[PDB]
Design a protein around this nucleic acid. Structure first.
Ligand SMILES: [Mn+2]
Ligand SMILES: [Mn+2]
Ligand SMILES: [Mn+2]
Length: 430
DNA sequence: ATTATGACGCT
DNA sequence: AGCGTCATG
């Protein structure tokens, strides 16, 4: 009882931009705004592959990983924006720069961990303590939470979405103990006030809408963020976890959407996250390993300790291109030309990174795939990265992979290469 | 013939 | 170090 640490020490938010690449394109081209539209890379094969979908287009069943020609079958008036192509390959610079815009606004409120191009975690514990000592027991008006959902409410003893949102929020605010500066539910509520302000600032200063989740840790904040998209935020309290998890498929939790989650389901004979509570920590550790087992044991009770890392910048900068089927690289000149294209984009991004962020990469990683290998990477080799020069890094990459060519002929390349990847890593301050 | 990344765990 | 897993704009 008095010693069961309930993992309610922190206030953590996850902010995720709605249909990010689509919003970037809609800001640039007002003709795309408030329309079914999607962002595609390339065009010749099946109209290009969709990587981002506006909510209007999602209503027609358009999804990521769909070919545009097929999406057009579902949504004949779908509008498409194409990713820029530079040096023969997709170039995602516009979206990376847009991401930096959003990350810089978020960093004004608290330290953030960049989790992806369009999302960051926020540790709001200290900002909440500050805002609470500023409020001085004053209760929290529903007017401060105009886009917040309280997960699990309304409950107990109107038929429109906004009406139910407001009913649930009213139930939450009425149950609140606004005099206790250490109540976790109050702390989450103030956290949600701050996140409303953060999201207002992002939209005001960039044009971009986002959603957010507010809870006591990263996994719950991410899950909460997904519950009411687009353009809304969701508070998942510690108390909401049992009901939320009682019907929550195991795969919906970050880290469990793959092989490990499938093995939880098959080994334990369960479907939902809440069913995990019936196993001891040792049982879970026996099946899934010591770390995963401790993590599952705590996570199914709403508890997770992974910190919000103070890291706004990516740890690696990389360039990759697939060469499927008939496009696979089968000559030395081909392989060298594409290594040079990738290296030229890498050099440009690295030089910008050095100027902006006062750091230099020191390791170059070269990864390839060979035709007929089921794995995404067939080979991975590192070498020193001592100079930001594309000709040098492409020669070095070729030097470290050239021994994969089983062709006795030095001109041909066999088996042909279906992917090239260059990645700069191990940054140092300079 | 979803493609282009980026993080992190394992050994 | 190099490999595998997970995430997905
Ligand atoms: Mn998003
Ligand atoms: Mn995201
Ligand atoms: Mn998505």
């Amino acid at each position: 009882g008095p010693h069961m640490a309930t993992g309610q020490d922190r206030v953590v938010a996850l902010v995720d931009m709605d249909c990010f690449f689509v919003q970037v394109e809609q800001r640039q081209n007002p003709h795309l705004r408030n329309k079914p539209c999607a962002v595609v890379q390339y065009k010749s094969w099946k109209g290009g592959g969709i990587i981002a979908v506006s909510y209007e287009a999602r209503a027609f069943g358009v999804t990521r990983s769909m070919w545009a020609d097929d999406a057009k079958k579902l949504c004949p008036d779908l509008l498409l924006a194409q990713v820029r192509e530079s040096r023969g390959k997709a170039n995602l610079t516009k979206y990376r720069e847009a991401s930096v815009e959003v990350m810089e606004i978020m960093s004004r409120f608290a330290v953030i961990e960049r989790a992806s191009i369009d999302e960051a975690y926020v540790d709001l514990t200290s900002a909440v303590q500050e805002r609470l000592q500023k409020l001085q027991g004053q209760p929290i008006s529903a007017d401060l939470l105009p886009s917040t959902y309280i997960e699990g409410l309304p409950q107990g003893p109107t038929v429109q979405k906004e009406g139910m949102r407001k009913q649930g929020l009213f139930q939450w605010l009425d149950s609140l103990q606004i005099d206790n500066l250490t109540s976790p539910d109050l702390q989450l509520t103030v956290g949600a006030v701050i996140v409303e302000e953060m999201r207002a600032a992002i939209e005001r200063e960039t044009g971009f809408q986002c959603s957010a989740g507010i809870s006591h840790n990263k996994v719950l904040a991410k899950l909460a963020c997904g519950l009411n998209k687009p353009n809304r935020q969701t508070l998942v309290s510690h108390g909401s976890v049992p009901q939320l998890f009682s019907q929550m498929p195991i795969r919906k939790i970050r880290s469990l959407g793959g092989k490990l989650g499938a093995s939880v389901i098959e080994i334990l004979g369960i479907e939902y996250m809440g069913e995990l509570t019936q196993f001891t920590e040792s049982q879970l550790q026996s099946h899934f390993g010591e770390k995963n087992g401790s993590w599952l044991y705590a996570m199914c009770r709403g508890i997770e300790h992974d910190p919000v890392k103070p890291r706004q910048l990516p740890k690696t900068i990389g360039c990759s291109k697939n060469f499927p089927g008939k496009t696979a690289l089968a000559t030395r000149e081909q392989v060298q030309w594409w290594l040079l294209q990738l290296a030229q984009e890498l050099e440009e991004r690295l030089t910008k990174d050095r100027n902006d962020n006062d750091r230099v990469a020191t390791q170059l990683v070269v990864s390839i795939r060979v035709q007929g290998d089921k794995r995404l990477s067939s080979l991975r080799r590192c070498c020193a990265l001592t100079r930001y020069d594309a000709h040098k890094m492409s020669h070095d990459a070729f030097t470290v992979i050239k021994n994969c060519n089983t062709s006795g002929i030095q001109t041909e390349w066999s088996p042909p290469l279906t992917m090239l990847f260059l990645c700069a890593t191990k940054f140092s301050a300079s």
